[PDB]
Amino acid sequence: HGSLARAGKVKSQTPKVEKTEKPKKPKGRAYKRLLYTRRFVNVTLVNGKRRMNPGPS
Amino acid sequence: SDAVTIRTRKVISNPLLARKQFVVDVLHPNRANVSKDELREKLAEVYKAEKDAVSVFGFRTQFGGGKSVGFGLVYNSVAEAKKFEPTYRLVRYGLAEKVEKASRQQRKQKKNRDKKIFGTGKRLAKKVARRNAD
Amino acid sequence: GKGKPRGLNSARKLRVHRRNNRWAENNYKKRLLGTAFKSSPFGGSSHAKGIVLEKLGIESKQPNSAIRKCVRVQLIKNGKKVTAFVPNDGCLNFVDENDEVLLAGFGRKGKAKGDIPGVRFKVVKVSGVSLLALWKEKKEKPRS
Amino acid sequence: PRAPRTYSKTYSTPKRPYESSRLDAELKLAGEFGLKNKKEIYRISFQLSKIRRAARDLLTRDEKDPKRLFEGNALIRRLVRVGVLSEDKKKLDYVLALKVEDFLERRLQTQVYKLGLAKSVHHARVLITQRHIAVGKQIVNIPSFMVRLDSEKHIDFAPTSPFGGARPGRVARRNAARKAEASG
RNA sequence: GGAUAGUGGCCUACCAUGGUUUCAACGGGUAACGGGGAAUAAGGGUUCGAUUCCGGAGAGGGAGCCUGAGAAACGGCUACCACAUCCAAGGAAGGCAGCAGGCGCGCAAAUUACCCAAUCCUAAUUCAGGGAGGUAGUGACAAUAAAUAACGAUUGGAAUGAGUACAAUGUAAAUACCUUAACGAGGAACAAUUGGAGGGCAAGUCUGGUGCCAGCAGCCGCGGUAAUUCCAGCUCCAAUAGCGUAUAUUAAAGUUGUUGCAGUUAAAAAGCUCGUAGUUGAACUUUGGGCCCGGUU
């Protein structure tokens, strides 16, 4: 304990990992359509309840 | 253009200014826009009057082409047009010549410089020349 | 009779009673006395530029344990010295001595957030460059 | 200087922004009507709430009150002219019974889709905004164009639109020129 | 009686001793020009109104005054004060809280542009003039509409606006807009961000790094070698050309309580009584009944 120096230790020491390239997401009404068709016809997430961001179990 | 079919609505006559005024709508399907000179000559022919007597201004094109709606004006002569139409419209039509007024800033500087001098200034010029050459 | 007057002509009494009682209100008294104009370091301002005097490490309150990074900033417009928090990871290294820094409130109106003792203001811009921009590499500090 | 140019806001964001049921219902509406933002449902709900407040203040008035009659007949007349209301439900209480779905269904997007000029509601919006659909005889690119009761009969492709029998656009011309160049 | 354009302690001479005040005078502060109005509100209400309209007051402070119907006029003079300019060292000339613009102050606010074409204004006056006013430049202050993609077959055609541009309209002349020859989509393209994922407050019991350190966190709180809370990746979420932050204010606030608070113990019944102002203050004075007229159902 005791840190006047070492400010930003974790921010500096964290191993950098770049943003991987992914297909561009649509914007606007297209994204609203994507959300609707991902949350209302893809309701397979239900396990008693509807999980919006299920963990990889 | 193609099937201009120039229509003139609200054609109330104006003897006070010696003119007939009307809102002119021109339909030009499959065309960008019809030019001022073409509209002027067409209105002159349709009203059996001289081209320089008629005048049109303020043409607003409707959305998506098809037609433009604006204001028309035909006089009883060419002298009436020359005396009642403004200078900018006359030079726009070519019936007059644009004045060569100096721009406002330098015109006002000239006005102030002349204001700071009293009289014709011939005596001032002579005295200044004598003092400078002496 | 519920204490307060009920007479049809007691409007003055009601008005004066309310006038005396309003002074107990926290915000009403503050606005009427103008302590924002008089006593507050910002003078009722949303922001204030100042010149940092020295860096500081202020220990966090319980149950937390950490050394929050702060700066002693003397306001340019007022001359008052206040402690300001540098609110992002590693952003303390951006701020140097005698650097013109913009200060904003800490969200809580004239109070301190969470486990910071006595620090009411935070740095937003350093030498005209945003702290979050410098943190996220969107801008480069002139350092001049 | 010039007299101030008056303006107003056309919507009102809701309190408790974060109700799961409200979010799900509005996303249902957006998905099944092609709305680009929640701002469109907010605007529609704000218009609904305004006209409903007017209708409630109108119903509060006593019957055959001159103001009640005048404003009520004006409101229902404009509602039926827009088409949000229906002719059979000409009474004032149906204004209260109205829902946002009626206003969302009287839009130009969904009306184009109902007329069948589009594959989907999103296709309808795309066609609308590329100056292809034209009410009456004039090009309009407003997805939220509240169609009047005498306009759905005259909704069709624009005379200038390549789908309306005009010159076949630009991509078709480019590909035809490329094909002709190759075959030459 | 003077003075006034005129009433008047407006001023002057004589005379009486009066005028205001606990129904809050006088004095002090105002980060106070007043109002029409603005934000937010079941009803009551709270806060704001420098600012586009009306009325005031000011031209750095203060006074005096000429002309004129109209001025205590400052883009008119006179003097002092405080600034400040050119001098050839005897002299002379100024008030941007107009327009632009510069410095300073700051968290905080635009071009030393074009034009009298509108709306008006003035003059001897249709014609001249007008930084009044309009146009353009800057402008994520705020408001309106709304692109960032649609379809087909299991990879293709078809459409389009951004962005250019002959042309015309537009305009005082122009810039843009409305139209439109021609050019202008296939992604590494013409690439939408701002905040967040423990709860309020839906959205990760995913991975790597750190190990009460760094740090996050409006509040509760997370973190001390298995972090759903820090720094990163992926995914997801809310709003979306907008999103967040700070301050102030409003609703929530029945925590300002007239509607509509609480006083035994949570803060609060003065130690008790008297008592002026103030608030409130027992009942009773014409009722009941007949005969018609004319309105609405």
DSSP code, position C3: S
Q: Where are the beta strands (DSSP E) in D39-155?
A: 133-135, 138-139
What is the C-alpha to C-alpha distance for residues C77 and C97, in angstroms, rounded to an integer? 19
C109 C-beta less than 7 Å away from strand E: yes
Assess contact for B43 and B24: CB atoms under 8 A: yes
Enter the tokens of residue A4.
């006047």
- Name the nt closest to C116 by C-alpha to C1': E217
What is the C-alpha to C-alpha distance for residues D85 and A26, in angstroms, rounded to an integer? 35
Assess contact for B70 and B58: CB atoms under 8 A: yes
| Closest by Cβ to B66, choosing from D131, D138, D140 | D138
Q: Which amino acid is at D27?
A: L
Q: Where are the beta strands (DSSP E) in chain B?
A: 7-9, 13-14, 19-28, 54-61, 66-75
Enter the tokens of residue C103.
């200060």
DSSP code, position B100: -
Q: List the helix and strand counts (H, then E) for chain C.
A: 4, 6
List, in sequence order, every residue forming a beta bridge with C50; answer none if it has no partner: C75, C101
Q: How many domains does chain C contain in total?
A: 1
DSSP code, position D2: P
Subunit contact C65:A1, Cβ cutoff 8 A: yes
Q: List the helix and strand counts (H, then E) for chain A.
A: 2, 0
Q: Which amino acid is at C106?
A: F
The contacts of residue B13 (CB under 8 Å, 6+ apart) are B19, B20, B21
Question: What is the SS3 assignment for D126?
Answer: helix
What are φ and ψ of residue D5, in 5° steps? -85, 105
First to last CA, chain C: 73
Kind and range of the H or E element at C71? strand C67-75
DSSP code, position D163: G
Q: Which amino acid is at A15?
A: P
Best CA proximity match to D93, nearest among D69, D58, D46: D58
Cis bond before residue D17 (omega within 30° of 0): no
Q: What Rg value do the Cα atoms of chain C yield, rounded?
A: 22
Enter the tokens of residue C124.
């937003």
The contacts of residue C89 (CB under 8 Å, 6+ apart) are A8, A10, A11, C135
Assess contact for B96 and B109: CB atoms under 8 A: no
Q: Is A6 exposed, middle or buried (0-12, 13-18, 19+ CB in 10 A)?
A: exposed
Q: Are strands B19-28 and B66-75 parallel, antiparallel or unpaired?
A: antiparallel
What are φ and ψ of residue A8, in 5° steps? 85, 25
Assess contact for D70 and D93: CB atoms under 8 A: no
Assess contact for C83 and C119: CB atoms under 8 A: yes
Strand E-proximal residues of D, range 75-104, CB below 7 A, are none
What is the C-alpha to C-alpha distance for residues B28 and D159, in angstroms, rounded to an integer? 12
Q: Where are the beta strands (DSSP E) in B46-113?
A: 54-61, 66-75
DSSP code, position C52: E
Give the Cβ contact number of residue D54 at 10 Å: 14
Enter the tokens of residue B129.
């020349």
Q: Which amino acid is at B42?
A: K
What are φ and ψ of residue C19, in 5° steps? -60, -45
The contacts of residue D99 (CB under 8 Å, 6+ apart) are D48
Tell me which chain A residue has its CA closest to the CA of residue C88. A8
Is D123 part of the contact surface with chain A (CB cutoff 8 Å)?
A: no
What is the C-alpha to C-alpha distance for residues C90 and C11, in angstroms, rounded to an integer? 61
Q: Which chains touch C (3 or more CB pairs under 8 A)?
A: A
Give the Cβ contact number of residue B71 at 10 Å: 15
The contacts of residue D82 (CB under 8 Å, 6+ apart) are D106, D146, D148, D149
D137 C-beta less than 7 Å away from strand E: no
Q: Which amino acid is at B14?
A: N
Rounded to whole angstroms, what are the CA distances from B45 to B8, B42, B51?
Answer: 13, 5, 8
Kind and range of the H or E element at C81? strand C81-85
Give the Cβ contact number of residue D90 at 10 Å: 13
Task: Name the minimum distance, in Å, from the CA of C90 to any CA of chain A.
Answer: 4
C1' (E155) to CA (D160) span, angstroms: 31
Q: Which long-range contacts (CB under 8 A, 24 or more apart) does D75-83 make?
A: D75/D51, D79/D51, D80/D149, D81/D148, D81/D149, D82/D106, D82/D146, D82/D148, D82/D149, D83/D147, D83/D148, D83/D149, D83/D152
Stated in angstroms to one decimal place, the resolution of this structure is 3.1
Query: What DSSP line would sit under C111-122, residue for residue?
Result: S--TT-SS--EE
The contacts of residue D177 (CB under 8 Å, 6+ apart) are none
Q: What Rg value do the Cα atoms of chain A yield, rounded?
A: 20
Q: How far is CA C45 from the centre of its chain?
A: 9
List, in sequence order, every residue forming a beta bridge with B25; answer none if it has no partner: B7, B69
Kind and range of the H or E element at C53? strand C47-59
Angle between helices D108-115 and D121-129 (to 10 degrees): 110
C20 C-beta less than 7 Å away from strand E: no
Strand E-proximal residues of C, range 72-91, CB below 7 A, are 75-77, 87-91
Best CA proximity match to C80, nearest among C69, C72, C90: C72
B92 C-beta less than 7 Å away from strand E: yes
**Edge-first strand listing for the sheet containing D156-157:** D138-139, D133-135, D156-157
Q: Where are the beta strands (DSSP E) in A1-57?
A: none
What is the C-alpha to C-alpha distance for residues A10 and A14, in angstroms, rounded to an integer? 6
Best CA proximity match to D38, nearest among D15, D16, D20, D12: D12
Assess contact for B68 and B39: CB atoms under 8 A: no
What is the C-alpha to C-alpha distance for residues D133 and D144, in angstroms, rounded to an integer? 13
Q: Which amino acid is at B7?
A: R
Rounded to whole angstroms, what are the CA distances from C81 to D2, D16, D144?
Answer: 47, 40, 56
Is A4 part of the contact surface with chain C (CB cutoff 8 Å)?
A: yes
The contacts of residue D130 (CB under 8 Å, 6+ apart) are D141
B68 C-beta less than 7 Å away from strand E: yes
| Closest by Cβ to D28, choosing from A29, A30, A40 | A40
Best CA proximity match to B90, nearest among B102, B104, B78, B100: B78
Tell the residue number behind the tokens 């005295």, with chain if given. Answer: B127
The contacts of residue B53 (CB under 8 Å, 6+ apart) are B44, B74, B75, B76, B77, B78, B80, B81
Subunit contact D122:A40, Cβ cutoff 8 A: no
Enter the tokens of residue A23.
């297909």
Enter the tokens of residue D110.
């969904």
Q: How far is CA B116 from the centre of its chain?
A: 36
Largest Cα separation within chain B, whole Å, is: 81
Q: How far is CA D16 from the centre of its chain?
A: 27
Tell the residue number behind the tokens 């007059």, with chain if given. Answer: B96
Enter the tokens of residue C133.
């921009």
Assess contact for C127 and C103: CB atoms under 8 A: no
List, in sequence order, every residue forming a beta bridge with B67; answer none if it has no partner: B27
What is the C-alpha to C-alpha distance for residues B13 and B4, in angstroms, rounded to an integer? 24
Tell the residue number behind the tokens 């004239």, with chain if given. Answer: C110
Task: Name the minimum distance, in Å, from the CA of A51 to any CA of chain C.
Answer: 32
Question: What is the SS3 assignment for D88?
Answer: coil
Q: Assign residue C137 a region (left: φ > 0; alpha: ψ between -120 and 50; beta: otherwise).
A: left
List, in sequence order, every residue forming a beta bridge with B20; answer none if it has no partner: B13, B74
What is the C-alpha to C-alpha distance for residues D31 and D25, in angstroms, rounded to an integer? 10
Subunit contact B64:D137, Cβ cutoff 8 A: no
Domain that holds residue C119: 1-144
Assess contact for D29 and D43: CB atoms under 8 A: no
List, in sequence order, every residue forming a beta bridge with C54; answer none if it has no partner: C72
